[PDB]
Amino acid sequence: EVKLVESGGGLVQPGGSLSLSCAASGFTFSDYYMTWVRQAPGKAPEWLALIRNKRNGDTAEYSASVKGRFTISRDYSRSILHLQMNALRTEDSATYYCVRQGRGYTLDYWGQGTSVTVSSAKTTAPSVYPLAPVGSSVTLGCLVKGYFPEPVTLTWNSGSLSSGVHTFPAVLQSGLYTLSSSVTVTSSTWPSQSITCNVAHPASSTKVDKKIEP
């Protein structure tokens, strides 16, 4: 079956460069036009570039937003799609997708995506603070502050406690991100039982547990 796997994303300075690549499999690479599409959090997808195949000139098309800065190319000998990203700007930050164009000029199959962050801010481990109340039901929380870049992963009781949870999207304040999560349980559930907050931040090898104590 058709599969696309992109790679080469990460944190890069403004004005810097990044080389993205897409591994295509399960289909004949040379038979299809290929494209790159990106999506910023809470935005509509944005088509970036298309490259034709050998039978049709191997020529390319670009959106005005990346024209001149991004270059799309293909390696037939390895069925790899490339996107050379130069003179990057903060608003280029998004998830980049390798996407195939099928019959009827249709972008049918998408890749998992590779994340790109363009910022001057530097990588930073999060802090992670437990949030205990000041009956019937009680609301606990977990505050993850001062990290960069995205993302982090937060769970309650290693993922066993998944009900009554509200995990809020990360918000930038400089500089550094802030993320929070709340969990609401029966009053007889806590603190009689142990509820712990698990945070992981790969970009800093952070892996921390914070128990909510009354």
Binding site: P45, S127, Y129
Partner: protein, 212 residues
């Protein structure tokens, strides 16, 4: 450049409903129009191609139609897994352009937010390192207002707000608000209050604590 105008930017409906999403191209694009579904946290999936052709793995409750400049996506008998954002895409001319998208939400009875306030943790207080958090949870409809007061006085400076997508379990919305102070300023004050103003009342819901 062809502009794609997608109406119902947001659409509130009930499970089992029949709903329709529209796509108007600023230029004739023949049959070169496709529809996509994107669940939160997931990648867009192809639903309809060539305006009216159902993609291989797509249920029959999804149908599309239209030619030229006007296109419509119809979802008959809306299901829970159908709750998502939908985009149209023209594939006739370059640049390729998407519609603005349509975000589906489920209708439900109005709900007031459950408010909880949290003083800075001792850890952050060592230091320093002072953040006060307030959760406005499980309320409906979407819109909501938060106000911070320190010893009575309105504070907006170091406030950070975040909002969740519609909860899949109870169809409600939630909000997190964090007020960050310096350890020094936090300890010069006593009263910290979180005020939520929701549609369900002209009177704000107030939560607070004393000492800092």
């Amino acid at each position: 450049d062809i502009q794609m105008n997608q109406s119902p930017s947001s659409l509130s409906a009930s499970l089992g409903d029949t709903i329709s999403i529209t796509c108007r191209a600023s230029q004739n694009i023949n049959i070169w129009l496709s529809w996509y579904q994107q669940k939160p946290g997931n990648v867009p999936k192809l639903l309809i191609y060539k305006a009216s052709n159902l993609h291989t793995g797509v249920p029959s409750r999804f149908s599309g139609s239209g030619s030229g400049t006007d296109f419509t996506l119809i979802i008959s008998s809306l299901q829970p897994e159908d709750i998502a954002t939908y985009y149209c895409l023209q594939g006739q001319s370059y640049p390729r352009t998407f519609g603005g998208g349509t975000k589906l939400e489920i209708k439900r009875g109005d709900a007031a937010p459950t408010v909880s306030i949290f003083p800075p943790s001792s850890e952050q207080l060592t230091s320093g390192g002072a953040s006060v958090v307030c959760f406005l949870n499980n309320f409906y409809p979407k819109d909501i207002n938060v106000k911070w007061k320190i010893d009575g006085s309105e504070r907006q400076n170091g406030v950070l707000n975040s909002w969740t997508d519609q909860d899949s379990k109870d169809s409600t919305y939630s909000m997190s608000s964090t007020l960050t102070l310096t350890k020094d300023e936090y300890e010069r004050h006593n009263s910290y209050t979180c005020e939520a103003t929701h549609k369900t009342s002209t009177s704000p819901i107030v939560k607070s604590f004393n000492r800092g």
